[PDB]
Amino acid sequence: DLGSRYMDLKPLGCGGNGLVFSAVDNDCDKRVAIKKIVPQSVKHALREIKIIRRLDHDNIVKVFEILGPSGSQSVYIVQEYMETDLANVLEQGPLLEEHARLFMYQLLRGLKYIHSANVLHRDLKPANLFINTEDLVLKIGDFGLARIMLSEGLVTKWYRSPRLLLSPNNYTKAIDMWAAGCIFAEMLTGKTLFAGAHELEQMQLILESIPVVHEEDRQELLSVIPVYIRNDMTEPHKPLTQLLPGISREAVDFLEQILTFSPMDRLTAEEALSHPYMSIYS
Numbered sequence: 001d002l003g004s005r006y007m008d009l010k011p012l013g014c015g016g017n018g019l020v021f022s023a024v025d026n027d028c029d030k031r032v033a034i035k036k037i038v039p040q041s042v043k044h045a046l047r048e049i050k051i052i053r054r055l056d057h058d059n060i061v062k063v064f065e066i067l068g069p070s071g072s073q074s075v076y077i078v079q080e081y082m083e084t085d086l087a088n089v090l091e092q093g094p095l096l097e098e099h100a101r102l103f104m105y106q107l108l109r110g111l112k113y114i115h116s117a118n119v120l121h122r123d124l125k126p127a128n129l130f131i132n133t134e135d136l137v138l139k140i141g142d143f144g145l146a147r148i149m150l151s152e153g154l155v156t157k158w159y160r161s162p163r164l165l166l167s168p169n170n171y172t173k174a175i176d177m178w179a180a181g182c183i184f185a186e187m188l189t190g191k192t193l194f195a196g197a198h199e200l201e202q203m204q205l206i207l208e209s210i211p212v213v214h215e216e217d218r219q220e221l222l223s224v225i226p227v228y229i230r231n232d233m234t235e236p237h238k239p240l241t242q243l244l245p246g247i248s249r250e251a252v253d254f255l256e257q258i259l260t261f262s263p264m265d266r267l268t269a270e271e272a273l274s275h276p277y278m279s280i281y282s
């Protein structure tokens with residue numbers, strides 16, 4: 001019951017920072033999502049506020065207000081209420097190719113925007129992608145958004161690129177592109193593309209399906225895991241076509257251009273939108 005504006009406070013879940021509540025705005029009779037934030041946390045909240053406050057795109061969750069002691073402009077981030085998240089949608093099964101393709105287009109539009117603003121998403125995963133099922137609108141959650149320049153066991157590693165498994169602190173625009181490809185594959189199958197228990201099993205799963213076409217990358221992998229490194233890494237044992245058996249050639253071909261081992265062969269959000277597979281939303 002914090003403030004006179006935000007009534008009927010009901011929990012929605014838990015973010016990587018704090019709790020999320022669902023509340024009704026008293027000014028306009030429309031629902032909002034409020035993030036409560038409980039030092040090193042003070043510096044981390046200051047950066048997050050400055051960024052998300054200046055971003056406004058159709059595929060980025062809208063941030064309405066920044067509050068503190070009960071409606072004063074701990075911190076409270078008031079943002080738009082979305083019907084559900086992608087994780088919830090995919091728990092009910094895979095999507096029709098037309099829906100996976102439409103959400104991928106929106107995800108890429110949202111990424112092209114934040115990348116253009118030199119912001120990246122450090123935690124791109126289906127739980128951070130919000131959906132309004134009637135409108136078929138996908139929006140990228142604000143938590144995780146950062147400038148390009150405790151509870152560790154609870155952070156998801158399944159959408160991490162091979163480069164991010166090898167250099168865990170270095171974040172780039174390309175790492176978001178890998179996660180976008182993993183999310184697309186998951187929308188089509190309903191299953192996690194690479195579901196490794198630890199960083200070692202993860203890399204082994206990717207290496208079973210993704211070709212290593214550069215000697216620099218193969219030399220780097222030979223130092224980390226010599227046993228599962230062959231002389232010809234150009235031909236995986238279980239390629240992407242085998243991991244997505246029911247889905248179309250067009251979709252697998254597009255995904256093969258995103259799920260590249262090296263960030264230098266990978267399509268940027270802008271290049272992926274220009275690809276004939278995405279360019280169909282004129």
Ligand SMILES: CN1CCC(n2cc(Nc3ncc4nnn(-c5ccc(F)cc5C#N)c4n3)cn2)CC1
Nearest residue numbers: 012013014015020033080081082083084085141143
């Ligand atoms: C457990 N499962 C049940 C369904 C649930 N759900 C969430 C919404 N709407 C909604 N709209 C705008 C939001 N902005 N942040 N955020 C979050 C909500 C929960 C959370 F953990 C992290 C974030 C973050 N960032 C938002 N949720 C509708 N249903 C998701 C969690």
